[PDB]
Amino acid sequence: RQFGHLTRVRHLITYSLSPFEQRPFPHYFSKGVPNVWRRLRACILRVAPPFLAFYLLYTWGTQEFEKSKRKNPAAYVN
Amino acid sequence: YAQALQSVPETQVSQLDNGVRVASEQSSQPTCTVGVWIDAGSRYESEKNNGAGYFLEHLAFKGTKNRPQNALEKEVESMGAHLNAYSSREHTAYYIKALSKDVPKAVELLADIVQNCSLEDSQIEKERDVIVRELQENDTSMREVVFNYLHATAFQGTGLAQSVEGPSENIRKLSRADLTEYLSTHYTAPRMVLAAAGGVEHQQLLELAQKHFGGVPFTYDDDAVPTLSKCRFTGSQIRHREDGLPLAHVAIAVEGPGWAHPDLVALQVANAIIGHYDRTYGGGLHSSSPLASIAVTNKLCQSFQTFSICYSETGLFGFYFVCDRMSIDDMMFVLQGQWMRLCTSISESEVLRGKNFLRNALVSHLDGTTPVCEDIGRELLTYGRRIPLEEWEERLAEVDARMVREVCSKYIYDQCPAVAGPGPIEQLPDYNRIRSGMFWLR
């Protein structure tokens, strides 16, 4: 698929400025950073949970293993 | 020839202790045309003041207090004179064309309008809905909307960006007053010019103007003409898509110098070289204007035209084309490419023709009375005086290749243009692309 045969688009006025007449930098601290958080806080509660869960299952798993290695002071009290 | 130019009657000019400048050119011609060209326009309008200059032009004829409607027209019709006119962004005029045997009568008439318009509150409330309709017509003239939108984005934010016509909301609410607030504010002698051409004898004109334009300037203000707020050019685009339309229009341009600037010549010659095409012509063999040629060979556009629309202190040097939903791209490419060629490797043999082509329009620009007055009307107003064809001649009879290059590049190379395009333009690439189309991979 090429250009000019994509969609029947009617009534959409778009205005954009040359990159040299605008600033790429952009508006960090205004809209910039804000939205970043707007997202960390949006999906944090949807991504992190499982990873967190793994972690536990990792630690638990490891400790226990590292434990099942140490002797039961009472495997021979005699 | 050159002798033909020289033997061309100088143009007479002399201002009033009033402010008006009265100039004109004389010939044998029974007929003539005369008009007052105000330094008035849309540019001079505000956010709530936009429209007036027009809503005005539209009542500028429906009468005065001295002689109401039915009579003015009846007095005009009855004498066989044609009173027509316009209103741009920085230029408005009102010219009539009679048999020169009416200089004093036409002149009076003129004065009686630019100064006393009925502005019949009942006449207005009609012309109101008239424009609002007449505007709805200007609208499907894609051939135009594409230019306003060009202005709209080219000079975004400033006064030029506002269209001579003005928003519907203003025309829907302009007050009996606001119109007058416009008239009394801008319609003043210092910014108005009484020019004419035909069989008229300057002095007779003067005295009549000097007679019907009994204006009197007290303050220092009244005698001073305000210079306008500079308009920021803004390389950008504005796309009003609609694949529902037969075809799309595209208009791109760079900032223009302004009448004053001597380069507008060489520049004018530039536009001479690529010129314009339009399927009716008869030339896949056309003169250099490859844009033309190529436009034919590869059936690029329905029509394309180059333009250096300029104003007081700014301008719009570009090109505008109309093409099938499908060949929009190839066109730009080929076209925009030309600009480059134009100011990167243009030849003498080319400019040679360019010139002569201009020298032909240069002359035919002044074909009749009405047109001549136009220049005079204009010349003074924007340039300061009148530029004789003998002058323009030299001006552009001395532009060499290397000069065109030096110029066009100076206003086109790696400049951020403003593009405008309504219609099925899905095929027109983004900006960056038509932007990096400004520098030639030399």
Short mmCIF file of C-alpha atoms in Angstrom, two decimals:
data_model
loop_
_atom_site.label_atom_id
_atom_site.label_comp_id
_atom_site.label_asym_id
_atom_site.label_seq_id
_atom_site.Cartn_x
_atom_site.Cartn_y
_atom_site.Cartn_z
CA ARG A 1 0.00 0.00 0.00
CA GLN A 2 1.30 3.41 -1.10
CA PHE A 3 0.10 7.06 -0.66
CA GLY A 4 -3.08 8.57 -2.03
CA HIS A 5 -5.06 5.38 -1.75
CA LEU A 6 -5.39 5.12 2.02
CA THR A 7 -8.63 6.67 3.24
CA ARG A 8 -11.69 8.78 2.39
CA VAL A 9 -10.95 11.62 4.79
CA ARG A 10 -13.26 14.61 4.86
CA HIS A 11 -13.04 17.88 6.76
CA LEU A 12 -9.83 17.64 8.73
CA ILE A 13 -7.91 20.83 9.05
CA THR A 14 -4.43 20.32 10.43
CA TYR A 15 -1.96 23.05 11.24
CA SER A 16 1.71 22.29 11.94
CA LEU A 17 4.77 24.53 11.99
CA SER A 18 8.20 24.15 10.44
CA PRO A 19 10.58 22.60 12.98
CA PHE A 20 12.77 25.65 12.71
CA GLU A 21 9.89 27.94 13.63
CA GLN A 22 9.07 25.86 16.66
CA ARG A 23 11.05 24.27 19.43
CA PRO A 24 11.83 20.50 19.59
CA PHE A 25 13.31 20.80 23.01
CA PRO A 26 9.58 21.00 23.99
CA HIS A 27 7.73 22.04 27.15
CA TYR A 28 9.22 19.78 29.83
CA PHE A 29 8.09 20.60 33.36
CA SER A 30 4.86 21.95 31.88
CA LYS A 31 3.37 19.06 29.88
CA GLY A 32 6.59 17.10 29.56
CA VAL A 33 7.51 15.44 32.82
CA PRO A 34 3.87 15.59 34.06
CA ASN A 35 2.61 13.10 31.48
CA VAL A 36 5.55 10.86 32.19
CA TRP A 37 4.29 10.39 35.72
CA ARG A 38 0.72 10.41 34.45
CA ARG A 39 1.83 7.09 33.04
CA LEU A 40 4.31 5.54 35.52
CA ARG A 41 1.22 6.08 37.68
CA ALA A 42 -1.35 4.40 35.47
CA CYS A 43 0.45 1.17 34.64
CA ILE A 44 2.65 0.77 37.73
CA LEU A 45 -0.33 -0.93 39.32
CA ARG A 46 -0.67 -3.16 36.23
CA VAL A 47 2.95 -4.06 35.43
CA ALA A 48 4.81 -4.14 38.74
CA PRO A 49 2.47 -6.54 40.59
CA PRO A 50 3.50 -9.70 38.69
CA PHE A 51 7.17 -8.71 38.67
CA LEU A 52 6.88 -8.13 42.39
CA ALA A 53 5.24 -11.54 42.76
CA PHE A 54 8.13 -13.16 40.88
CA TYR A 55 10.66 -11.48 43.12
CA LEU A 56 9.03 -13.04 46.17
CA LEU A 57 8.86 -16.46 44.54
CA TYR A 58 12.53 -15.89 43.73
CA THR A 59 13.66 -14.92 47.21
CA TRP A 60 11.48 -17.44 48.97
CA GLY A 61 12.74 -20.07 46.61
CA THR A 62 16.37 -19.12 47.16
CA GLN A 63 16.32 -18.71 50.93
CA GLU A 64 14.45 -21.98 51.48
CA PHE A 65 17.03 -23.70 49.26
CA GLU A 66 19.87 -22.09 51.16
CA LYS A 67 18.14 -23.33 54.29
CA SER A 68 17.48 -26.95 53.30
CA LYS A 69 21.27 -27.04 53.12
CA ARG A 70 22.03 -26.17 56.75
CA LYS A 71 22.02 -28.98 59.33
CA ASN A 72 19.23 -29.60 61.84
CA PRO A 73 21.09 -29.15 65.12
CA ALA A 74 18.84 -32.08 66.09
CA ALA A 75 19.35 -34.60 63.25
CA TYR A 76 21.70 -36.10 65.90
CA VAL A 77 21.41 -34.71 69.48
CA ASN A 78 23.00 -38.06 70.38
CA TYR B 1 10.85 51.10 -29.28
CA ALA B 2 12.96 52.45 -26.44
CA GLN B 3 11.95 55.71 -28.04
CA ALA B 4 8.29 54.54 -27.66
CA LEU B 5 8.88 54.23 -23.96
CA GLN B 6 10.55 57.61 -23.68
CA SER B 7 7.87 59.37 -25.73
CA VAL B 8 5.44 58.05 -23.11
CA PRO B 9 3.68 60.95 -21.30
CA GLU B 10 5.05 61.57 -17.81
CA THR B 11 2.56 61.25 -14.98
CA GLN B 12 1.54 64.40 -13.14
CA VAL B 13 1.27 64.43 -9.38
CA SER B 14 0.65 67.13 -6.76
CA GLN B 15 -0.76 66.80 -3.25
CA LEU B 16 -3.14 69.08 -1.37
CA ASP B 17 -2.49 71.27 1.68
CA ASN B 18 -5.12 68.67 2.64
CA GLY B 19 -3.13 65.48 2.17
CA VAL B 20 -4.58 63.78 -0.91
CA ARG B 21 -2.10 63.23 -3.72
CA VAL B 22 -3.56 63.95 -7.14
CA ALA B 23 -1.93 62.26 -10.10
CA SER B 24 -2.84 60.91 -13.49
CA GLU B 25 -1.75 60.34 -17.07
CA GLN B 26 -3.04 62.08 -20.23
CA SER B 27 -3.72 60.71 -23.71
CA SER B 28 -5.98 61.51 -26.67
CA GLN B 29 -8.70 59.14 -25.46
CA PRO B 30 -12.27 60.47 -25.19
CA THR B 31 -12.87 58.02 -22.41
CA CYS B 32 -10.97 57.68 -19.17
CA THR B 33 -11.34 56.32 -15.63
CA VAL B 34 -10.68 57.93 -12.27
CA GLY B 35 -10.52 56.74 -8.69
CA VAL B 36 -9.60 57.21 -5.06
CA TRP B 37 -7.24 54.50 -3.77
CA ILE B 38 -7.32 54.29 0.00
CA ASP B 39 -4.42 52.81 2.00
CA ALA B 40 -7.28 50.90 3.68
CA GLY B 41 -7.78 47.19 4.11
CA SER B 42 -8.35 44.14 6.23
CA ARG B 43 -4.85 44.30 7.62
CA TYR B 44 -6.04 47.47 9.26
CA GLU B 45 -8.86 45.55 10.95
CA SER B 46 -9.14 44.17 14.48
CA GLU B 47 -10.42 40.95 16.04
CA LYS B 48 -13.89 42.50 16.25
CA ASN B 49 -13.19 45.11 13.59
CA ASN B 50 -12.55 42.49 10.84
CA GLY B 51 -14.94 42.69 7.94
CA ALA B 52 -15.88 46.38 7.95
CA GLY B 53 -13.63 47.36 5.06
CA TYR B 54 -15.73 44.92 3.08
CA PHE B 55 -19.21 45.35 4.57
CA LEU B 56 -18.21 48.84 3.63
CA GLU B 57 -17.20 48.32 -0.01
CA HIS B 58 -20.71 46.83 -0.14
CA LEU B 59 -22.52 50.02 0.91
CA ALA B 60 -20.03 52.36 -0.69
CA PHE B 61 -22.40 52.44 -3.65
CA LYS B 62 -25.89 52.11 -2.22
CA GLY B 63 -25.78 55.87 -1.71
CA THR B 64 -24.82 59.00 0.22
CA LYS B 65 -26.86 61.50 2.26
CA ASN B 66 -26.54 64.21 -0.39
CA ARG B 67 -28.02 61.85 -3.00
CA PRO B 68 -29.64 58.60 -1.74
CA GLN B 69 -29.60 55.28 -3.61
CA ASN B 70 -32.07 55.41 -6.48
CA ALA B 71 -30.47 58.74 -7.47
CA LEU B 72 -26.73 57.98 -7.27
CA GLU B 73 -27.11 54.92 -9.38
CA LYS B 74 -29.58 56.76 -11.61
CA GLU B 75 -27.05 59.58 -11.86
CA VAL B 76 -24.27 57.09 -12.58
CA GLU B 77 -26.18 54.79 -14.90
CA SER B 78 -27.73 57.82 -16.67
CA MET B 79 -24.35 59.22 -17.62
CA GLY B 80 -22.88 55.92 -18.71
CA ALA B 81 -20.05 55.76 -16.19
CA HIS B 82 -18.84 52.53 -14.58
CA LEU B 83 -18.17 52.82 -10.86
CA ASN B 84 -16.40 49.65 -9.73
CA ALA B 85 -13.87 48.76 -7.06
CA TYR B 86 -12.38 46.47 -4.44
CA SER B 87 -10.76 46.08 -1.01
CA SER B 88 -7.71 43.83 -0.41
CA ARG B 89 -5.62 43.52 2.76
CA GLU B 90 -3.68 46.77 2.46
CA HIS B 91 -5.39 48.41 -0.50
CA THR B 92 -8.87 49.59 -1.34
CA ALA B 93 -10.02 51.72 -4.23
CA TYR B 94 -13.09 53.09 -5.98
CA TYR B 95 -12.74 54.01 -9.60
CA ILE B 96 -15.21 55.25 -12.20
CA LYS B 97 -14.89 55.39 -15.94
CA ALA B 98 -16.60 58.05 -17.97
CA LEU B 99 -15.93 60.12 -21.07
CA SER B 100 -13.45 62.59 -19.48
CA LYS B 101 -16.20 65.10 -20.20
CA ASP B 102 -17.16 64.18 -16.66
CA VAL B 103 -13.92 64.58 -14.66
CA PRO B 104 -15.58 67.19 -12.39
CA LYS B 105 -18.79 65.16 -12.16
CA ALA B 106 -17.06 61.80 -11.57
CA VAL B 107 -14.66 63.42 -9.06
CA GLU B 108 -17.51 64.88 -7.04
CA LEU B 109 -19.23 61.52 -7.01
CA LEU B 110 -16.01 59.91 -5.75
CA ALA B 111 -15.68 62.39 -2.93
CA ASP B 112 -19.35 62.00 -2.01
CA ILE B 113 -18.74 58.27 -1.30
CA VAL B 114 -15.36 58.10 0.40
CA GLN B 115 -16.80 60.79 2.68
CA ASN B 116 -20.57 60.50 2.96
CA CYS B 117 -22.09 57.06 2.69
CA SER B 118 -25.73 56.63 3.52
CA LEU B 119 -24.94 53.58 5.61
CA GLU B 120 -28.70 53.27 5.81
CA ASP B 121 -29.17 51.05 8.88
CA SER B 122 -31.90 49.39 6.82
CA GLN B 123 -29.63 49.05 3.81
CA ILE B 124 -27.00 47.43 6.07
CA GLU B 125 -29.22 44.75 7.64
CA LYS B 126 -29.75 43.54 4.03
CA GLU B 127 -26.16 43.74 2.75
CA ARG B 128 -25.45 41.84 5.95
CA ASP B 129 -27.27 38.71 4.83
CA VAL B 130 -26.02 39.44 1.29
CA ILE B 131 -22.40 39.12 2.23
CA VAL B 132 -23.07 36.12 4.49
CA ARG B 133 -24.35 34.50 1.27
CA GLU B 134 -21.76 36.05 -1.04
CA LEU B 135 -19.21 34.72 1.39
CA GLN B 136 -20.69 31.25 1.27
CA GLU B 137 -20.00 31.53 -2.43
CA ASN B 138 -16.40 32.76 -2.14
CA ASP B 139 -16.07 29.55 -0.20
CA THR B 140 -16.31 26.84 -2.83
CA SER B 141 -13.86 28.78 -5.00
CA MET B 142 -11.11 26.45 -3.81
CA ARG B 143 -8.96 28.47 -6.16
CA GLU B 144 -9.13 31.16 -3.46
CA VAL B 145 -9.80 29.59 -0.07
CA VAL B 146 -6.44 27.97 -0.71
CA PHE B 147 -4.83 31.43 -0.67
CA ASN B 148 -6.51 32.83 2.40
CA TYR B 149 -5.55 29.63 4.24
CA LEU B 150 -2.09 30.28 2.88
CA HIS B 151 -2.16 33.73 4.42
CA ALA B 152 -3.85 32.25 7.47
CA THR B 153 -0.85 30.07 8.22
CA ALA B 154 1.84 31.98 6.37
CA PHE B 155 1.29 35.02 8.56
CA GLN B 156 -0.49 33.23 11.41
CA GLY B 157 -1.29 35.38 14.43
CA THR B 158 -0.86 38.78 12.74
CA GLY B 159 -3.13 41.17 10.82
CA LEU B 160 -2.57 39.83 7.30
CA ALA B 161 -3.75 36.34 8.34
CA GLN B 162 -7.29 37.76 8.64
CA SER B 163 -9.13 37.40 5.32
CA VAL B 164 -10.32 40.52 3.55
CA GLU B 165 -13.80 39.14 3.96
CA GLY B 166 -13.81 38.65 7.75
CA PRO B 167 -15.51 35.96 9.92
CA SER B 168 -19.21 35.25 9.66
CA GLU B 169 -19.69 36.22 13.30
CA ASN B 170 -18.54 39.81 12.63
CA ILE B 171 -20.50 40.29 9.44
CA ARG B 172 -23.39 38.89 11.47
CA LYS B 173 -22.88 41.55 14.12
CA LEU B 174 -21.14 44.63 12.70
CA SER B 175 -22.88 47.80 13.94
CA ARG B 176 -24.21 50.75 11.98
CA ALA B 177 -21.46 52.38 13.96
CA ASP B 178 -18.41 50.14 13.51
CA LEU B 179 -18.69 50.79 9.78
CA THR B 180 -18.55 54.52 10.34
CA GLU B 181 -15.88 53.86 12.94
CA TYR B 182 -13.96 52.37 10.00
CA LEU B 183 -14.71 55.08 7.46
CA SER B 184 -13.85 58.07 9.63
CA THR B 185 -10.77 56.26 10.89
CA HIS B 186 -9.06 55.24 7.62
CA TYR B 187 -10.72 57.11 4.78
CA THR B 188 -8.41 60.12 4.96
CA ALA B 189 -6.79 62.22 2.25
CA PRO B 190 -3.19 61.59 3.35
CA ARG B 191 -3.80 57.88 2.70
CA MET B 192 -6.06 58.42 -0.32
CA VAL B 193 -5.03 59.00 -3.92
CA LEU B 194 -6.95 60.63 -6.72
CA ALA B 195 -5.59 59.15 -9.93
CA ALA B 196 -6.89 59.01 -13.47
CA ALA B 197 -6.03 58.32 -17.10
CA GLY B 198 -7.53 59.22 -20.47
CA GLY B 199 -8.03 62.63 -22.06
CA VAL B 200 -7.97 64.62 -18.79
CA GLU B 201 -5.90 67.81 -18.19
CA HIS B 202 -4.37 67.48 -14.75
CA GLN B 203 -5.10 71.02 -13.65
CA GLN B 204 -8.80 70.59 -14.35
CA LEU B 205 -8.65 67.50 -12.18
CA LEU B 206 -6.72 69.14 -9.34
CA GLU B 207 -9.13 72.04 -9.05
CA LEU B 208 -12.12 69.70 -9.02
CA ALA B 209 -10.57 67.50 -6.35
CA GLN B 210 -9.05 70.55 -4.75
CA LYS B 211 -12.71 71.62 -5.00
CA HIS B 212 -14.79 68.61 -3.86
CA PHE B 213 -12.22 67.38 -1.33
CA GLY B 214 -12.54 70.37 0.95
CA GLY B 215 -10.80 68.52 3.75
CA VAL B 216 -9.06 70.41 6.56
CA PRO B 217 -6.35 68.92 8.85
CA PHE B 218 -6.05 70.55 12.28
CA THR B 219 -3.85 68.34 14.51
CA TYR B 220 -0.42 66.91 13.53
CA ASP B 221 -2.03 63.47 13.79
CA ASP B 222 -4.51 64.04 10.94
CA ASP B 223 -1.55 64.90 8.72
CA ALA B 224 0.36 61.73 9.73
CA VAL B 225 -0.12 58.22 8.30
CA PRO B 226 0.36 55.35 10.81
CA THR B 227 2.84 52.61 9.86
CA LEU B 228 1.53 49.08 10.41
CA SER B 229 2.41 46.43 12.93
CA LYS B 230 4.95 43.99 11.43
CA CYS B 231 3.51 40.55 10.56
CA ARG B 232 5.50 37.49 11.63
CA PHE B 233 6.02 35.03 8.81
CA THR B 234 5.64 31.50 10.09
CA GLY B 235 6.94 28.63 8.00
CA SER B 236 4.16 26.14 8.47
CA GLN B 237 1.30 24.38 6.89
CA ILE B 238 -2.45 24.18 7.05
CA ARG B 239 -4.30 21.24 5.54
CA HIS B 240 -8.04 21.25 4.94
CA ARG B 241 -8.41 17.78 3.49
CA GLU B 242 -11.44 16.47 1.70
CA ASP B 243 -11.16 13.61 -0.68
CA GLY B 244 -14.74 14.51 -1.50
CA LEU B 245 -13.40 17.22 -3.82
CA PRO B 246 -12.61 16.85 -7.54
CA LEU B 247 -9.07 17.72 -6.78
CA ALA B 248 -6.69 19.29 -4.39
CA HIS B 249 -4.99 22.68 -4.48
CA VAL B 250 -1.54 23.38 -3.11
CA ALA B 251 0.09 26.72 -2.45
CA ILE B 252 3.51 27.07 -0.90
CA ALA B 253 5.58 30.20 -0.45
CA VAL B 254 8.47 32.03 1.25
CA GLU B 255 8.35 35.50 2.82
CA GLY B 256 8.29 38.33 0.27
CA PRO B 257 10.45 41.52 0.61
CA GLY B 258 7.83 44.28 0.32
CA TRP B 259 7.11 46.68 -2.54
CA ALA B 260 9.97 48.98 -1.64
CA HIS B 261 12.76 46.42 -2.11
CA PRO B 262 14.56 46.77 -5.47
CA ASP B 263 14.98 43.02 -5.67
CA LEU B 264 11.26 42.53 -6.27
CA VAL B 265 12.43 43.10 -9.83
CA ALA B 266 14.97 40.27 -10.31
CA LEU B 267 12.51 38.28 -8.25
CA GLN B 268 9.67 39.18 -10.61
CA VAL B 269 11.91 37.99 -13.43
CA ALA B 270 12.32 34.79 -11.49
CA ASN B 271 8.62 34.03 -11.62
CA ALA B 272 8.88 34.83 -15.30
CA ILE B 273 11.08 31.84 -15.89
CA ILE B 274 8.80 29.09 -14.54
CA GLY B 275 5.62 31.03 -15.23
CA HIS B 276 2.33 29.12 -15.39
CA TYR B 277 0.57 26.29 -17.20
CA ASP B 278 -3.06 25.42 -17.70
CA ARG B 279 -4.21 22.48 -19.86
CA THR B 280 -5.77 24.70 -22.53
CA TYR B 281 -2.43 26.22 -23.63
CA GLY B 282 -0.87 24.24 -26.45
CA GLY B 283 2.65 23.32 -25.48
CA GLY B 284 4.31 20.18 -24.21
CA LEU B 285 6.94 22.01 -26.15
CA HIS B 286 6.71 25.15 -24.05
CA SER B 287 9.46 27.61 -23.43
CA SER B 288 12.00 26.73 -20.77
CA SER B 289 9.26 26.86 -18.06
CA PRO B 290 9.90 23.17 -17.50
CA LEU B 291 7.41 23.20 -14.74
CA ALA B 292 5.18 23.82 -17.71
CA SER B 293 6.80 21.24 -20.01
CA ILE B 294 7.14 18.57 -17.37
CA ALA B 295 3.63 19.44 -16.30
CA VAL B 296 2.62 18.29 -19.72
CA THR B 297 4.85 15.28 -20.36
CA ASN B 298 3.92 13.65 -17.07
CA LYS B 299 0.46 15.28 -16.89
CA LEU B 300 1.35 16.88 -13.58
CA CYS B 301 -1.26 19.57 -13.02
CA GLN B 302 -4.54 21.03 -14.26
CA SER B 303 -2.92 24.40 -13.80
CA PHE B 304 -0.14 26.07 -11.86
CA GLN B 305 0.81 29.71 -11.37
CA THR B 306 3.76 31.53 -9.87
CA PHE B 307 3.16 34.66 -7.78
CA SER B 308 5.07 37.30 -5.78
CA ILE B 309 2.06 38.85 -4.03
CA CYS B 310 3.72 41.58 -1.99
CA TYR B 311 2.66 44.23 0.50
CA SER B 312 3.94 47.28 2.33
CA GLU B 313 6.69 45.59 4.36
CA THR B 314 6.19 41.84 3.72
CA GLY B 315 5.23 39.42 0.93
CA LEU B 316 4.42 35.92 -0.35
CA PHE B 317 6.66 34.57 -3.10
CA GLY B 318 5.49 31.12 -4.09
CA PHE B 319 3.51 28.99 -6.49
CA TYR B 320 0.08 27.43 -6.63
CA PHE B 321 -1.12 24.39 -8.50
CA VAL B 322 -4.26 22.34 -8.97
CA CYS B 323 -3.95 18.61 -9.60
CA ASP B 324 -5.72 15.25 -9.52
CA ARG B 325 -5.80 13.55 -6.18
CA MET B 326 -3.06 11.34 -7.66
CA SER B 327 -0.33 13.43 -9.24
CA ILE B 328 -0.02 15.93 -6.43
CA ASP B 329 3.33 14.65 -5.32
CA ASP B 330 5.28 14.29 -8.55
CA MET B 331 4.14 17.87 -9.15
CA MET B 332 5.44 19.47 -5.99
CA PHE B 333 8.64 17.57 -6.41
CA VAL B 334 9.12 18.68 -10.00
CA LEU B 335 7.95 22.19 -9.14
CA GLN B 336 9.71 22.81 -5.88
CA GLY B 337 12.66 21.32 -7.67
CA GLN B 338 12.47 24.14 -10.16
CA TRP B 339 12.83 26.79 -7.49
CA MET B 340 16.12 25.13 -6.64
CA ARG B 341 17.31 24.86 -10.22
CA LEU B 342 16.16 28.44 -10.54
CA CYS B 343 18.49 29.70 -7.84
CA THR B 344 21.28 27.17 -8.11
CA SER B 345 21.89 26.83 -11.86
CA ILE B 346 19.80 29.28 -13.87
CA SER B 347 21.19 30.44 -17.24
CA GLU B 348 21.42 33.69 -19.21
CA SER B 349 19.57 32.30 -22.19
CA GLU B 350 16.81 31.75 -19.69
CA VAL B 351 16.71 35.13 -18.00
CA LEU B 352 16.85 36.66 -21.49
CA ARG B 353 13.40 35.34 -22.26
CA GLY B 354 12.15 35.85 -18.71
CA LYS B 355 12.83 39.57 -19.01
CA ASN B 356 11.11 39.99 -22.39
CA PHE B 357 8.21 38.00 -20.98
CA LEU B 358 8.00 40.45 -18.10
CA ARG B 359 8.50 43.40 -20.42
CA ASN B 360 5.45 42.12 -22.23
CA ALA B 361 3.27 41.93 -19.10
CA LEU B 362 5.09 45.04 -17.93
CA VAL B 363 3.54 46.85 -20.85
CA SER B 364 0.23 45.03 -21.07
CA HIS B 365 -0.12 45.65 -17.34
CA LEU B 366 -1.00 49.15 -18.58
CA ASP B 367 -3.60 48.36 -21.24
CA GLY B 368 -6.35 50.96 -21.31
CA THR B 369 -7.41 53.64 -18.86
CA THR B 370 -8.81 51.74 -15.89
CA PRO B 371 -5.59 49.68 -15.59
CA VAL B 372 -3.27 52.66 -15.95
CA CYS B 373 -5.07 54.43 -13.14
CA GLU B 374 -4.57 51.24 -11.13
CA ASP B 375 -0.80 51.55 -11.26
CA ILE B 376 -0.90 55.26 -10.61
CA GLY B 377 -3.42 54.55 -7.88
CA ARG B 378 -1.03 51.90 -6.59
CA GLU B 379 2.43 53.21 -7.50
CA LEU B 380 2.13 56.31 -5.34
CA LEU B 381 0.35 54.59 -2.46
CA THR B 382 2.88 51.73 -1.99
CA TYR B 383 6.04 52.93 -3.82
CA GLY B 384 5.85 56.67 -3.11
CA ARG B 385 5.58 57.91 -6.68
CA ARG B 386 5.04 56.50 -10.18
CA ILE B 387 7.35 54.03 -11.83
CA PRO B 388 7.53 54.77 -15.61
CA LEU B 389 7.70 51.91 -18.07
CA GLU B 390 10.95 53.59 -19.05
CA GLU B 391 12.11 52.94 -15.48
CA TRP B 392 10.75 49.42 -14.86
CA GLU B 393 12.49 48.80 -18.17
CA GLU B 394 15.99 49.48 -16.91
CA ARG B 395 15.13 47.98 -13.49
CA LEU B 396 14.56 44.63 -15.17
CA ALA B 397 16.47 45.25 -18.38
CA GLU B 398 19.58 44.88 -16.24
CA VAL B 399 18.98 41.60 -14.40
CA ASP B 400 21.53 38.95 -15.35
CA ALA B 401 21.50 35.23 -14.59
CA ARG B 402 23.89 35.54 -11.69
CA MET B 403 21.55 38.20 -10.34
CA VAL B 404 18.49 35.96 -10.37
CA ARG B 405 20.45 33.20 -8.70
CA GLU B 406 21.77 35.57 -6.05
CA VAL B 407 18.18 36.73 -5.43
CA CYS B 408 15.90 33.70 -5.43
CA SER B 409 18.38 31.76 -3.34
CA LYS B 410 18.43 34.71 -0.97
CA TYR B 411 14.66 34.22 -0.44
CA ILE B 412 14.19 30.51 -1.18
CA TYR B 413 17.24 28.43 -0.35
CA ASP B 414 16.78 26.54 2.90
CA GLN B 415 13.94 28.79 3.89
CA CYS B 416 10.94 27.47 5.82
CA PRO B 417 7.99 27.86 3.42
CA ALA B 418 4.30 27.96 4.16
CA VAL B 419 2.14 25.41 2.40
CA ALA B 420 -1.61 25.35 2.07
CA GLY B 421 -3.67 22.57 0.64
CA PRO B 422 -7.43 21.84 0.49
CA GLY B 423 -8.80 18.74 -1.23
CA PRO B 424 -7.80 15.05 -1.64
CA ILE B 425 -4.22 15.61 -0.64
CA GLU B 426 -3.49 12.32 1.07
CA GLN B 427 -0.71 12.15 -1.45
CA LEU B 428 1.10 15.30 -0.36
CA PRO B 429 4.06 14.24 1.89
CA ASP B 430 4.54 15.83 5.33
CA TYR B 431 6.32 19.12 5.86
CA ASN B 432 9.89 17.99 6.64
CA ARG B 433 9.82 16.41 3.26
CA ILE B 434 8.58 19.38 1.29
CA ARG B 435 10.88 21.29 3.58
CA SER B 436 14.09 19.44 2.75
CA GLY B 437 12.90 20.15 -0.75
CA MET B 438 14.21 23.64 -0.20
CA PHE B 439 17.90 22.71 -0.35
CA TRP B 440 19.48 21.14 -3.43
CA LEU B 441 21.79 18.19 -2.76
CA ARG B 442 24.41 20.31 -4.65
#
